[PDB]
Design an enzyme around this catalytic site. Sequence first.
Site, PDB file in Angstrom:
ATOM      1  N   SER A   1       4.353  -5.748  -3.281  1.00  0.00           N
ATOM      2  CA  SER A   1       4.596  -4.325  -3.485  1.00  0.00           C
ATOM      3  C   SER A   1       5.377  -3.724  -2.321  1.00  0.00           C
ATOM      4  O   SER A   1       6.550  -4.058  -2.129  1.00  0.00           O
ATOM      5  CB  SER A   1       3.273  -3.597  -3.698  1.00  0.00           C
ATOM      6  OG  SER A   1       3.487  -2.369  -4.352  1.00  0.00           O
TER       7      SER A   1
ATOM      8  N   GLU B   1       2.281  -4.474 -15.122  1.00  0.00           N
ATOM      9  CA  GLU B   1       2.515  -3.904 -13.801  1.00  0.00           C
ATOM     10  C   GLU B   1       2.125  -2.435 -13.716  1.00  0.00           C
ATOM     11  O   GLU B   1       1.669  -1.984 -12.659  1.00  0.00           O
ATOM     12  CB  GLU B   1       3.986  -4.066 -13.410  1.00  0.00           C
ATOM     13  CG  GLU B   1       4.346  -5.421 -12.826  1.00  0.00           C
ATOM     14  CD  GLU B   1       3.818  -5.630 -11.415  1.00  0.00           C
ATOM     15  OE1 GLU B   1       3.493  -4.637 -10.732  1.00  0.00           O
ATOM     16  OE2 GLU B   1       3.730  -6.798 -10.985  1.00  0.00           O
TER      17      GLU B   1
ATOM     18  N   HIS C   1      -1.257  -5.056 -11.348  1.00  0.00           N
ATOM     19  CA  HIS C   1      -0.538  -5.074 -10.086  1.00  0.00           C
ATOM     20  C   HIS C   1      -1.510  -5.350  -8.944  1.00  0.00           C
ATOM     21  O   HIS C   1      -2.519  -4.654  -8.791  1.00  0.00           O
ATOM     22  CB  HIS C   1       0.170  -3.728  -9.911  1.00  0.00           C
ATOM     23  CG  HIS C   1       0.836  -3.542  -8.583  1.00  0.00           C
ATOM     24  ND1 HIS C   1       2.190  -3.718  -8.400  1.00  0.00           N
ATOM     25  CD2 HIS C   1       0.340  -3.162  -7.383  1.00  0.00           C
ATOM     26  CE1 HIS C   1       2.497  -3.470  -7.139  1.00  0.00           C
ATOM     27  NE2 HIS C   1       1.392  -3.131  -6.501  1.00  0.00           N
TER      28      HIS C   1
ATOM     29  N   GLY D   1       0.808  -1.203   0.000  1.00  0.00           N
ATOM     30  CA  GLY D   1       0.000   0.000   0.000  1.00  0.00           C
ATOM     31  C   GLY D   1       0.845   1.257   0.000  1.00  0.00           C
ATOM     32  O   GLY D   1       0.437   2.292   0.537  1.00  0.00           O
TER      33      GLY D   1
END
Length: 523
Positions: free
Chosen positions: A195, A322, A435, A113
Amino acid sequence: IIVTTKNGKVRGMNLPVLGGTVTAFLGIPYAQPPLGRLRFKKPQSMTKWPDIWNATKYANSCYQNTDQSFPGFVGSEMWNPNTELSEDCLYLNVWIPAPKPKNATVMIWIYGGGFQTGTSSLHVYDGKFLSRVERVIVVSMNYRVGALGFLALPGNPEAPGNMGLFDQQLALQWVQKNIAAFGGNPKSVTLFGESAGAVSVSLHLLSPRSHPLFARAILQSGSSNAPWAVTSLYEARNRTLTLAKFIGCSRENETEIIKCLRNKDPQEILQNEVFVVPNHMLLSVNFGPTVDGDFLTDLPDTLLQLGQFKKTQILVGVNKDEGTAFLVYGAPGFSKDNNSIITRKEFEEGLKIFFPGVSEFGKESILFHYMDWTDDQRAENYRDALDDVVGDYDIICPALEFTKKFSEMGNNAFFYYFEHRSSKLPWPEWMGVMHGYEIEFVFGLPLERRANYTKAEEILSRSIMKRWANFAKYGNPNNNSTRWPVFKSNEQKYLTLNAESPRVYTKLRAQQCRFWTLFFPKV
Ligand SMILES: *[C@@H]1O[C@H](CO[C@@H]2O[C@@H](C)[C@@H](O)[C@@H](O)[C@@H]2O)[C@@H](O[C@@H]2O[C@H](CO)[C@@H](O[C@@H]3O[C@H](CO)[C@@H](O)[C@H](O[C@H]4O[C@H](CO)[C@@H](O)[C@H](O)[C@@H]4O)[C@@H]3O)[C@H](O)[C@H]2NC(C)=O)[C@H](O)[C@H]1NC(C)=O
Ligand SMILES: *[C@@H]1O[C@H](CO[C@@H]2O[C@@H](C)[C@@H](O)[C@@H](O)[C@@H]2O)[C@@H](O)[C@H](O)[C@H]1NC(C)=O
Ligand SMILES: *[C@@H]1O[C@H](CO)[C@@H](O)[C@H](O)[C@H]1NC(C)=O
Ligand SMILES: *[C@@H]1O[C@H](CO)[C@@H](O)[C@H](O)[C@H]1NC(C)=O
Ligand SMILES: *[C@@H]1O[C@H](CO)[C@@H](O)[C@H](O)[C@H]1NC(C)=O
């Protein structure tokens, strides 16, 4: 169902999972709540309780700005927190198979995030299916994000920086001190995240005090050497002083700038949090990891060069498309409600967003190598190229360079290339394999037939879960299925993941990554 920890007893629950049972403990406190004088400080050890702690519900999520770019749209709101927001959020969740194991492998998940949002209670992070099918123990924790988690004054213990990373490290210590009581082996711990969570896992690989806290690592669409991962120590100071200006806590006594912020409301801190960076987006980590000298002593690129990292196996990979998810949140001409056919002028304006400090000739270099080097005159040429520009520069090529560095030193690595687009994906077709949409297959959501995934998606999810658990247990994701070769520095083989037939190729995006690492720095 009561388990006794070093601080007290915890009460769990039994869950019906796929014709069986999984025992869940949701909301075990692993740190003293960072309230009052503890705000911006490193996490403190958890106190003891004499009673039974009902860990029967997801605890609170840490304070964070919520995504409101697409109101009422499920594709963006699925990532927003689904419990009450509160500074008292340092809790973890555990999933144990039924019947109880005795030395099960433990996989610890770290959400992403952008270090500004995220919580462990999201439905796509539910670890009950993984524990049911692969008979591992699944752990996930909440860590502070935003300024409350990464506000940094150099050397100042009132706000030292990387506090959210220390929140993860303390949860790792909880698993060492306590996972044996639940039936897990503390010597078979694998960290996996996506991520920003993959950046976090790859930063624990670069932090020596985290080395004895886990055995192996899995990096999904992220690595700590990505251009957006870590700021310098002087950069993080500039952003703390900028936040103090907007919120009205600017002083010349630095240690009392923090006493002022400690008396502001968390909602008030989140509102001025956005003005800190020149442009707020997903990859504009306004308050994230820094070179604090404590948790992180040098830039991840430098540490990788000097071989200063935990020598162990890693499983890295990226998704086919992505960059699309990032373009719909800032680049001109991109919308979730049309096919986003952008012009050359919009392409050059997209480069200005994702490359803020590079010259006009530098943008002409990116434009030549991604457009004018080939004869692609389709109507989607600029749109698809800008997907590859952001995808290669910020996710794919850094993840390949990180894997190469672990390979030069002689550690076994395994690289994947996710190619499957969910049949239930609410985003339009032009965004492709986005993504963040391999996670539901890693966590086994397509195994619920009442979720209405295709039959091949249940097979693909069981395959990915199998390889993920095999790597956590034996250090190798691999039998008559297609063999996943070891990523060697010389051949650089990787495996594609899709519902039809996984394939083995070599040198993923080789031409593009050679441009970003060998030529673009010189322009
Ligand atoms: C795909 O969609 C994007 C996003 O558009 C927005 O969402 C769509 C779902 C749909 O509802 C659209 O109507 C909505 O805008 C499109 O990109 C946007 O394109 C519009 C124009 O079509 C741009 O707005 C214009 O920008 C100019 C500079 O500010 C200016 O000329 C315009 O204002 C003038 O014209 C309007 C009449 O439209 C008038 O009311 C004004 O007073 C003034 O004269 C206008 O503001 C947006 O900025 C674009 N958004 C970006 C760049 O992020 C995209 O074109 C579309 N693509 C395809 C292929 O369909
Ligand atoms: C803790 O929970 C006790 C038992 O509650 C029952 O079992 C748990 C596992 C849940 O399924 C719950 O819904 C059930 O009712 C309660 O008797 C006890 O009061 C609870 N403790 C506190 C402090 O509220
Ligand atoms: C679990 O495995 C470890 C080695 O991985 C071993 O030392 C230990 O004795 C095993 N059994 C337990 C903790 O019951
Ligand atoms: C942050 O850095 C910019 C870059 O030049 C500088 O102009 C600005 O004054 C700095 N902000 C501070 C120190 O609050
Ligand atoms: C799934 O598809 C079936 C098709 O018969 C339908 O009945 C059901 O409502 C759909 N949704 C769910 C959530 O099961």
